[PDB]
Amino acid sequence: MTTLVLDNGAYNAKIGYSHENVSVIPNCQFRSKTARLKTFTANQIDEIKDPSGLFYILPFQKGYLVNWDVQRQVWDYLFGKEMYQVDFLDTNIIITEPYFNFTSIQESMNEILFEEYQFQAVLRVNAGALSAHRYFRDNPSELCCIIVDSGYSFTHIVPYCRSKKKKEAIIRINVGGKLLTNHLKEIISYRQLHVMDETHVINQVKEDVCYVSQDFYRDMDIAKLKGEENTVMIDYVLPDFSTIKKGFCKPREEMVLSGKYKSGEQILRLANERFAVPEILFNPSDIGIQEMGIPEAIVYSIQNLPEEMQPHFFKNIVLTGGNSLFPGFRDRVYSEVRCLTPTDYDVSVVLPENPITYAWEGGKLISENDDFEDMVVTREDYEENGHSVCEEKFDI
Amino acid sequence: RRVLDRAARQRRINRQLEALENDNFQDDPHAGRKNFQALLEEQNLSVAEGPNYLTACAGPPSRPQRPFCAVCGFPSPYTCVSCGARYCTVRCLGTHQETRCLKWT
Amino acid sequence: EGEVTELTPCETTISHVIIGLKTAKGTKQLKLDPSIFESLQKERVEAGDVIYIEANSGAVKRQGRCDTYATEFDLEAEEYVPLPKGDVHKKKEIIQDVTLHDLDVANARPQGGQDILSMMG
Amino acid sequence: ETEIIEGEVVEIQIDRKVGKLTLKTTEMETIYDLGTKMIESLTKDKVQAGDVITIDKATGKISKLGRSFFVQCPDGELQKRKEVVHTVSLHEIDVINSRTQGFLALFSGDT
Amino acid sequence: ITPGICFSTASLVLRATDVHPLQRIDMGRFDLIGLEGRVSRYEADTFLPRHRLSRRVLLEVATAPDPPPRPKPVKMSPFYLDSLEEKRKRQRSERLERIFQLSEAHGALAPVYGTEVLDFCTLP
Ligand SMILES: Nc1ncnc2c1ncn2[C@@H]1O[C@H](COP(=O)(O)OP(=O)(O)OP(O)(O)=S)[C@@H](O)[C@H]1O
Ligand SMILES: [Mg+2]
Ligand SMILES: [Zn+2]
Ligand SMILES: [Zn+2]
């Protein structure tokens, strides 16, 4: 009857019903030193009041599901009586998978979904396929599109035709939100104060203060200055979870140059990390990763494809994922791609209002279609043909 | 002063890059199944055997690497002789030598 | 005008030279008369160099290396120049005043010439 | 503004072109990765270990100002950004731009 | 043996006479002394007036297909874009017009003397 759309990401699971809204819930368990024997599951992290020193139990290592017990527990909580009360025997599930998912992981997914839960039908796709379907629904005149999925654990770039994914031109960049957060942790620990146990707070700081610079060396020169002219430098007050619940940035008028404050607030001063961290997406070699950045990879992926299709792909660059929410990300990507693109070809980069939920919206749209029943694999057909037909139907 | 061979520097760079993928830096507060490498070795994944995880990896960048100071992050004209780390000023060189040159404190 | 991304002479002698120039507003592929290859070789033009070519005369000036390559070595005796901002192909209609004396002195002595007498002159 | 590198040469290596150069001051020491043009410039002007030299980065202009064990080794930063001010007369501009190698006429008449 | 004199000047001084190509006209249309020893009276008077290209011939040759290969000696549209093609054909038209204008400009001048006159008048 009903259809469940799930984006089993390594950081956030986009789970919701086709007839309802979308919810963003962390897809990992939590443990804290304020609880002796208590493991938090999924959105229960809101209950804790001192997220400092939080321990993360992740089901994904390097963007692929490797820990099955925590993932099973998270799914049981999400599918349980508390969250959604999913009727497994009469529900279809659309669940996303990482690109080039290993054969073993696919077999385990099929077995778990068809036996441990006994879903009526399963449709396993890629988040980029849903994003491409949503984009083609929004723009019916476009025949080809390229999807940029800058997520938690990686950044893929995949070009899609009207009804097919070009597996030959798929390029993966091993830079994601996890890497950026860890790099910011390492920088802050090495420079000002040890925060390697404060993943949550450093992630919030990155989400709040970091931005993509249009002119890297101009910003570096501005940051190197001292005094009023150092407009890049800002002061951040870390949350102590006693009187300051959440971190915030001090107003510029309230800034003190000397760095000493009468209030005993633990103030973390970030000047060049504001744009150094986001720059790793565009220049992986900045930190030591000998891989091409996002714009060069987009250009390479397009230029691998035949010449006739290239102008269409250059016109339909789509930015999805959490890392795409950096200020100036779209402008920087457009500028670099325009610099690299042939002048006769127009370049258009589109950043949706909610890049997090793009794949979930695409899944909702594809569920409503009249071709939905042909895409899914049923349990009755699973009994006999499943193990072959799951690989056959799904274009992973 | 001592000099570190290419193997030591490459090992340090690989360790630093791998540490960025770590879930947590601390241990389990409770204090009392595979991994990615096991999955890769189980897949027996061979290069040029069709599109796969390895063939999807991004190639080397054309633009050269830009040096940044290992201490403060600003651009670094200088390269430390002992360990190959980049640095930009006498103060930064002293801090690097005290903190992370030779022995990894 | 722009940064050189490719410099490939096409053999039949050389029929033509295909060059790739990059700017902030895109990339353009140009086919050059084979006589321009000598000028390109004299100016020592390689990939990554920022050059300009006059369409009417074929003159080539290599105006430095692109500043994106400034970090390829820690110490080179190179002059690094920003990437040109406008289009690769630049057209300008100009009105310049010259005097008859300018044409007289332009035609009083020869210019260039690879002969030994011209060089000694 | 120009970038000027002044220090004492520690080791110079050239192999069949790539090369490395190690320079030191009294406060810091550094290894440089050399380009082809700087390798040619350092080969043309014989530079050996112990010489105190200054290099103009943009031009490769290397001038040896002595040897140290005679001039004391430089103290501060190895690479310094300096502001150089030149007052050039209109006559000097005219003579330099009059012909190729025309600056010679500033010293030998012949204008 | 003395070291040379190192004369240092402002880098801006060496660019005083330099003029950007977009800011100066082509002086090769008045180059008469450069034509001596290279251009003949035959080329200027008999050949070029007869065998100058026209826009019609240039367009016909450009539009026509490639010529058939020379015989060996014998011993005896879904992805089509209209705007892109319009831009490309406009560029081709501009290229052909430039080729015509440059060919006309580079053979407009006749030598003052010519190779034949100089050869005749040059004794051993
Ligand atoms: N406003 C923001 N600014 C910067 N980063 C942000 C922001 N909001 C979220 N993020 C980061 O975005 C990342 C999560 O992106 P997601 O799209 O949810 O990743 P994901 O879908 O789980 O990744 P995969 O590869 O598809 S499994 C996290 O690292 C967040 O810290
Ligand atoms: Mg995702
Ligand atoms: Zn520094
Ligand atoms: Zn060191």
HEC profile of chain B: CCCCCHHHHHHHHHHHHHHCCCCCCCCCCCCCCCCHHHHHHHHCCCCCCCCCCCCCECCCCCCCCCCECCCCCCECCEECCCCCCEECCHHHHHHHHHHCCCCCC
Chain B touched by A55 (CB under 8 Å): yes
- Per the listing, tokens 């940044």 go with B68
- Per the listing, tokens 């789970």 go with A15
CA distances from A95 to A9, A16, A129, B82 (A): 10, 11, 12, 51
Q: Are strands A317-320 and A144-150 parallel, antiparallel or unpaired?
A: parallel
CATH architecture of C1-106: Beta Barrel (2.40)
Alpha carbons D54 and D78: distance in angstroms, whole number: 10
Tokens at C62, concatenated = 């290599």
**Chains that contact C by 3+ CB pairs under 8 Å?**
A, B, D, E
Q: What CATH number is given to the structural domain containing A214?
A: 3.90.640.10
Alpha carbons E61 and A91: distance in angstroms, whole number: 68
Are the Cβ atoms of B78 and D79 closer than 8 angstroms? Answer: yes
Ligand 1 centroid vs A393 CA: distance in angstroms? 29
Cα within 13 Å of Cα(C7), Cβ side: 19
| Resolution given for this structure, in angstroms | 3.9
A351 within 8 A of A329, measured Cβ to Cβ: yes
Are the Cβ atoms of A196 and B60 closer than 8 angstroms? Answer: no
| Strand partners for A267 | A237
Tokens at C115, concatenated = 């002969």
| Strand partners for C28 | C21
Breaks (C-N over 2.5 A) in chain D follow: 16, 69
Q: How many CB atoms lie within 10 A of CB A25?
A: 19
Strands (E), chain E: none
Alpha carbons A131 and A63: distance in angstroms, whole number: 18
A296 within 8 A of A150, measured Cβ to Cβ: no
Breaks (C-N over 2.5 A) in chain B follow: 32
Ligand 2 centroid vs A9 CA: distance in angstroms? 5
Alpha carbons A43 and A26: distance in angstroms, whole number: 6
On the 0-12 / 13-18 / 19+ scale of CB atoms within 10 A, A389 is middle
* Interface contacts A/C by beta carbons within 8 Å: 28
Helix (H, G, I), strand (E, B) or coil at C25: coil
A121 within 8 A of A92, measured Cβ to Cβ: yes
Q: Which ligand is nearest to the CA of B82?
A: 4
- From A309, which residue of chain E is nearest by alpha-carbon distance? E79
Tokens at B54, concatenated = 């390895």
Cα within 13 Å of Cα(A277), Cβ side: 30
Ligand 4 centroid vs B29 CA: distance in angstroms? 35
Q: What is the tally of helices (H) and strands (E) in chain A? A: 13, 19
Instruction: Give the CA dihedral C53, C58, C64, C68, nearest 10 degrees.
Output: 40
Q: Which residue among D31, D32, D77 sits closest to B90, beta carbon to beta carbon? A: D77
Edge-to-edge order in the sheet of strand A267-270: A248-249, A234-237, A267-270
DSSP annotation of C96 reads: -
Write the Ramachandran bin of A113: left for phi over 0, alpha for psi from -120 to 50, otherwise beta.
alpha
Solved using:
cryo-EM
Which of C15, C73, C16, C13 lies closest to C48 in space, CA to CA? C73
Give the DSSP H or E segment for C106.
helix C100-106
| Strand partners for A378 | A121
Which residues of chain D have a CB within 8 Å of the CB of E10?
86, 88
Which of A168, A176, A202, A200 lies closest to A188 in space, CA to CA? A202
Q: Which residue among E7, E10, E16 sits closest to D97, beta carbon to beta carbon? A: E16
Alpha carbons D78 and D73: distance in angstroms, whole number: 11
Which of A20, A21, A17, A13 lies closest to A42 in space, CA to CA? A13
Chain A touched by C27 (CB under 8 Å): yes
Write the Ramachandran bin of A42: left for phi over 0, alpha for psi from -120 to 50, otherwise beta.
left
D75 within 8 A of D26, measured Cβ to Cβ: yes
- Rg of chain B over CA atoms, in angstroms? 19
Range of the domain at A188: 177-282
C6 within 8 A of C40, measured Cβ to Cβ: no
